[PDB]
Design a protein around this ligand. Sequence first.
Ligand SMILES: Nc1nc2c(ncn2[C@@H]2O[C@H](COP(=O)(O)OP(=O)(O)O)[C@@H](O)[C@H]2O)c(=O)[nH]1
Ligand SMILES: Nc1nc2c(ncn2[C@@H]2O[C@H](COP(=O)(O)OP(=O)(O)O)[C@@H](O)[C@H]2O)c(=O)[nH]1
Ligand SMILES: Nc1nc2c(ncn2[C@@H]2O[C@H](COP(=O)(O)OP(=O)(O)O)[C@@H](O)[C@H]2O)c(=O)[nH]1
Ligand SMILES: Nc1nc2c(ncn2[C@@H]2O[C@H](COP(=O)(O)OP(=O)(O)O)[C@@H](O)[C@H]2O)c(=O)[nH]1
Ligand SMILES: Nc1nc2c(ncn2[C@@H]2O[C@H](COP(=O)(O)OP(=O)(O)O)[C@@H](O)[C@H]2O)c(=O)[nH]1
Ligand SMILES: Nc1nc2c(ncn2[C@@H]2O[C@H](COP(=O)(O)OP(=O)(O)O)[C@@H](O)[C@H]2O)c(=O)[nH]1
Ligand SMILES: [Mg+2]
Ligand SMILES: [Mg+2]
Ligand SMILES: [Mg+2]
Ligand SMILES: [Mg+2]
Ligand SMILES: [Mg+2]
Ligand SMILES: [Mg+2]
Lengths: 151, 151, 151, 151, 151, 151
Amino acid sequence: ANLERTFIAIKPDGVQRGLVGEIIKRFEQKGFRLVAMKFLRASEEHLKQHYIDLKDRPFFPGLVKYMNSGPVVAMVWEGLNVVKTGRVMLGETNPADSKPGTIRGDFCIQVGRNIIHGSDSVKSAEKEISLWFKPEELVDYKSCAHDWVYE
Amino acid sequence: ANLERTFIAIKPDGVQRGLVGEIIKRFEQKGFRLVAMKFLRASEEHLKQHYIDLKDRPFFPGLVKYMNSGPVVAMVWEGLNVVKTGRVMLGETNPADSKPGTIRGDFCIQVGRNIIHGSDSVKSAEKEISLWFKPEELVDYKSCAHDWVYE
Amino acid sequence: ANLERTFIAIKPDGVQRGLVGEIIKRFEQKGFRLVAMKFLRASEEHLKQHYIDLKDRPFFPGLVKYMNSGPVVAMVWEGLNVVKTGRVMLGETNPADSKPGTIRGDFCIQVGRNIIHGSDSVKSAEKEISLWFKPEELVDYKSCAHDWVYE
Amino acid sequence: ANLERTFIAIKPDGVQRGLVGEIIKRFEQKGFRLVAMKFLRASEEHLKQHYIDLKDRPFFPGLVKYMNSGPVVAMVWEGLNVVKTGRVMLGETNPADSKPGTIRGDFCIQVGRNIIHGSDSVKSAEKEISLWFKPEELVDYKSCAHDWVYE
Amino acid sequence: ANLERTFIAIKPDGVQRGLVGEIIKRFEQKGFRLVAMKFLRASEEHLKQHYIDLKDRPFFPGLVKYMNSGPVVAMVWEGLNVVKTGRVMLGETNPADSKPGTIRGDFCIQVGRNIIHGSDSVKSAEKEISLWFKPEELVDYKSCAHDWVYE
Amino acid sequence: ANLERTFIAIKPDGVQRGLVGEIIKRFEQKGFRLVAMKFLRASEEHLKQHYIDLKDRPFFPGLVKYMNSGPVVAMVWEGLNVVKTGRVMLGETNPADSKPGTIRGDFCIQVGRNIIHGSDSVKSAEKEISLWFKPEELVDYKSCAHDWVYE
Ligand SMILES: Nc1nc2c(ncn2[C@@H]2O[C@H](COP(=O)(O)OP(=O)(O)O)[C@@H](O)[C@H]2O)c(=O)[nH]1
Ligand SMILES: Nc1nc2c(ncn2[C@@H]2O[C@H](COP(=O)(O)OP(=O)(O)O)[C@@H](O)[C@H]2O)c(=O)[nH]1
Ligand SMILES: Nc1nc2c(ncn2[C@@H]2O[C@H](COP(=O)(O)OP(=O)(O)O)[C@@H](O)[C@H]2O)c(=O)[nH]1
Ligand SMILES: Nc1nc2c(ncn2[C@@H]2O[C@H](COP(=O)(O)OP(=O)(O)O)[C@@H](O)[C@H]2O)c(=O)[nH]1
Ligand SMILES: Nc1nc2c(ncn2[C@@H]2O[C@H](COP(=O)(O)OP(=O)(O)O)[C@@H](O)[C@H]2O)c(=O)[nH]1
Ligand SMILES: Nc1nc2c(ncn2[C@@H]2O[C@H](COP(=O)(O)OP(=O)(O)O)[C@@H](O)[C@H]2O)c(=O)[nH]1
Ligand SMILES: [Mg+2]
Ligand SMILES: [Mg+2]
Ligand SMILES: [Mg+2]
Ligand SMILES: [Mg+2]
Ligand SMILES: [Mg+2]
Ligand SMILES: [Mg+2]
């Protein structure tokens, strides 16, 4: 089979607060497969295109500036319902609405500093994956745990 | 009802994915007393009795064969509302509906590989404990912390 | 706003069960600022004042005795909505109603041994802070991570 | 290969202090395979035979009484060098001499309450295994990560 | 029959880097009893007294300045061999020589930002406890675990 | 020497055994700055250049094959003595001799599956960094904690 994929980015605040390993561990222990990963400071234009649907929102200027203010960890993760499940794992957009046990619930306070991004839909994921990674950067392998994670 | 007991089994996938100590720690940390524990490859006939209520469901033979495909860790835990609270701790039957912070929410993806079993009621717990353990295998002792966990 | 403060106390059961660091870590990693902290055996009088609204409840004598039965860690934490959010982190009054991922959800079982206290409102918080701490015991400094937690 | 085995027991203090899960995780994460596990109060005669080479030592009486004073978690673990590297993981007999990051180094203080036992040699391991388990209690299965742990 | 005690302070970098809980957890897990604790910005004078033995060394002014640059967590811990064992837990003065598994080994790089202080000797412990704490701030109580930590 | 760099790669066994987050956290927690990171299946030729000094060793062919058998996580880390300190953090080449608390000591068993690589010297580090990364992939930014990790 060819499993669902989602795009996950650890925002500059996640990197600056030293939560990269912690956040990656949460995806690994869940049983999702890391497909791609790189580390870069995305240009304001890259970030504008990432968040193109939000361009007319008033917080958008500060969002783009915050997102370009340090490096990000960009990832692709694979598995059954990984898009929706990735989102549940993150918590709500606002850390204030995010439950203890979620990444945002556990680790942050304010919507403007909410440490992580996950694709909100499959069609979003595929667009975001194409924008952040070259095809060659997506690694096709099989997880040793697969048959212990899936029927 | 401080002497309530429940049956908890770590399924073959739980054992194979190295989650035994992680699971046990969650019960220990909560204040529940470990009463019995053993490690075995349960026979197909034993598993058919365990899941006798499901013998007509289409997933039954698959479920049995998987349950026999590796060892399980069988346990008896005791404490106030341990049956219901144990259930909460595991999360929903389907990992897709299990909240972050729960065992299945944190660690698995698919209902057919859902890493753990807990009794669904006192009556089920009593049946399961009888099925899985000899009476001499239930250990009598007082937990150190009891007077700090209970009034 | 961001200068809100709350009073958090680790109850004698939380100290005795070795949960002081685990509790503190949860507040630190969330991004809240530790403002004040001390360790003491609170007098029965001090405890009666802390719980003055409950003076006529049936459980109040047992409550005051339990709370005097060992030392307590008293703390003040700062941040946006720290009162409300602190409560979310603790769980519900009754650990039976507290979800996995919260302090009571993870660690305790019975309402009379529920390991921790948090102020239920800003007015409660300011009363409790005045009750437990001398003004000089409240330390003003800026958190390293502040600008990565707050826009 | 017919891989080496060792006998590990978590002593009554390890059980009472809630360290069973933690300990088991350290063995699991190292890549050792759990072969056998049970939970029991070992009789004084069982304990005398286990520690027979110490019978004339002055601490022997107290050792047997303490080891009988609560249940123990009895285990057999498999792996290349598991006896010697198991000992290294435990620390030195005296926790005072055990380094941080070892089990006794992290968790205990006094030689008479040193939380765990491990076989000191291959010959001791085989003797101890034979005395603590029935042959049928030793579960034969292959670890899913075997080929990632071994050449 | 007072057990041995030591003075441990979490330095300003320790607090700023959000390691207070982690650090305390290590001492609780080991079996030491928390006797005293408070949180304060130590004055230059207090710190010159604390480090008076170093007053003529080149790094002393820099040390005293750094130690005043943020609040510190000051603690008294009790147990068998706590002064020496405490030291071993911290690591060497220079993090470069501190082993993985020690506090400085896990968390620090440079000698002037080495996150924690522990007394060097019983005589120094006694002096430091007296310098930092009033007698009434030392809490006399018996630990839950004592009989499982000590024979 | 604060700008010293080393090359760390999580080997395919580390990726498959779900240790990526765990490993990254240890580097983060220590205070080193992540400079560059990517995830790829390294070609046999690329790996032959990486290990060119071992090309005549009997294990060389199998080493290259194993290192190509799954993706690796390639990283550049910066900090004072990061090459030597990084080596200490990994353990010894042989897991069998690696101390508990080190990455290999904690997580692996056999030299042929030793989960991680780190440069052995500054000269080796510069050669490996150049081999594995494009100049533009070394990210320029300041770590928020720098002034709390360094004088
Ligand atoms: N400062 C600020 N940022 C916001 C606000 N709403 C959304 N954002 C940021 O914009 C990101 C994208 O918004 P959105 O797609 O609606 O939410 P998401 O998919 O859950 O991340 C969020 O993750 C926040 O980082 C806001 O009101 N203020
Ligand atoms: N393959 C498969 N297994 C299922 C399904 N539903 C339940 N199971 C398995 O059967 C076990 C028992 O089912 P059930 O008693 O209803 O759920 P539980 O009490 O929450 O464990 C579950 O824990 C699953 O492992 C399904 O639709 N497909
Ligand atoms: N024993 C007992 N203690 C209670 C009961 N209800 C509340 N308490 C205790 O009294 C404390 C204060 O009560 P309350 O303010 O209503 O709950 P809280 O603000 O969530 O802590 C609780 O945290 C419990 O420790 C009860 O029914 N029985
Ligand atoms: N109370 C007490 N117990 C001891 C002493 N020496 C050893 N023991 C206990 O006896 C056990 C077995 O001793 P030994 O075979 O020499 O050490 P081990 O193989 O490292 O456990 C130790 O693990 C301790 O639990 C002592 O001096 N006093
Ligand atoms: N900046 C700087 N600080 C130092 C140096 N040597 C020691 N210190 C600091 O001064 C503290 C006290 O030194 P000392 O009492 O000898 O070592 P300790 O008992 O390990 O803490 C150390 O823990 C360091 O924080 C140095 O060479 N430079
Ligand atoms: N299969 C196998 N692999 C080995 C052996 N010795 C070394 N290796 C592998 O080759 C790598 C490089 O060896 P070396 O450069 O000498 O040590 P390193 O710098 O500590 O990794 C090791 O990290 C192992 O992955 C061996 O005897 N057998
Ligand atoms: Mg969106
Ligand atoms: Mg059922
Ligand atoms: Mg109240
Ligand atoms: Mg012996
Ligand atoms: Mg000194
Ligand atoms: Mg080499």
